Amino acid sequence: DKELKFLVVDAFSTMRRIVRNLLKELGFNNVEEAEDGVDALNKLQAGGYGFVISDWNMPNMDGLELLKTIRADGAMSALPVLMVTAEAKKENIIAAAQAGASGYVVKPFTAATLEEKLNKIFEKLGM
Numbered sequence: 001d002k003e004l005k006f007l008v009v010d011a012f013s014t015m016r017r018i019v020r021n022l023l024k025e026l027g028f029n030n031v032e033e034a035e036d037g038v039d040a041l042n043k044l045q046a047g048g049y050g051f052v053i054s055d056w057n058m059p060n061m062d063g064l065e066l067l068k069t070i071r072a073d074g075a076m077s078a079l080p081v082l083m084v085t086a087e088a089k090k091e092n093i094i095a096a097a098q099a100g101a102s103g104y105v106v107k108p109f110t111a112a113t114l115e116e117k118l119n120k121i122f123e124k125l126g127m
Contacts, residue, residue, distance in 0.1 A: 001127075006031040009040045009054040009066065010084075015107075019053055019084075022111045026118075037061025041069060044076055056085040056092065064099060071100040080121055 008019045008031060016033045023031050032049070034040035036058050044052075052070065056063040063083055070076050080102040085092065088106045096104060102121045105114065 001122075002027045003030050004028060004050040005048055006051045006053060007034055007040060007043060007049050008032070009034040009037070009052065009058070009063075011036060011055065011058045015055065019114075022109075022114050025111045026115055037063075037066040037069075040066055044070070044079075047075070049076075049079065052079055052081045054081060054083060056083055056096075064096065067096070067101055068099050080125055080127075082117060082121065 006023060006028060008016050008023075010016045010019070010033075020031050020033070023029075032043065034043055038061055040052070040054070043049075054063045054066055058066075067081055067083070070079055070081060081100070083096050083101045083104040084107055085104060086107055088104065093104060102125065103117055105117050
């Protein structure tokens with residue numbers, strides 16, 4: 001399972017590299033990157049991914065739109081999706097909860113905070 005394949009979606013390169021190094025630090029070296037929602041969806045179609053980490057607000061297709069699209073796609077309807085945000089607000093959290101987000105994490109975060117979140121979802125998703 002440390003071989004689970006992650007797709008990290010963020011408009012900003014620096015932010016994608018940060019998330020990538022935190023995963024490596026934790027033992028997950030099978031990570032991939034996407035620049036926006038469309039790029040994410042195109043990549044996911046090829047298959048083989050087992051976890052998606054996405055920022056909430058990307059230019060064009062935003063995290064919430066990406067999520068509702070993954071959830072509706074039969075082939076990828078069960079993919080775990082961690083939402084990343086700068087501002088946690090009851091309004092955004094519930095909306096994401098209702099659309100199917102597996103969880104949310106406020107940035108900036110450390111590998112210890114990310115791991116805590118990963119686990120809770122892994123055990124939630126019984127995987």
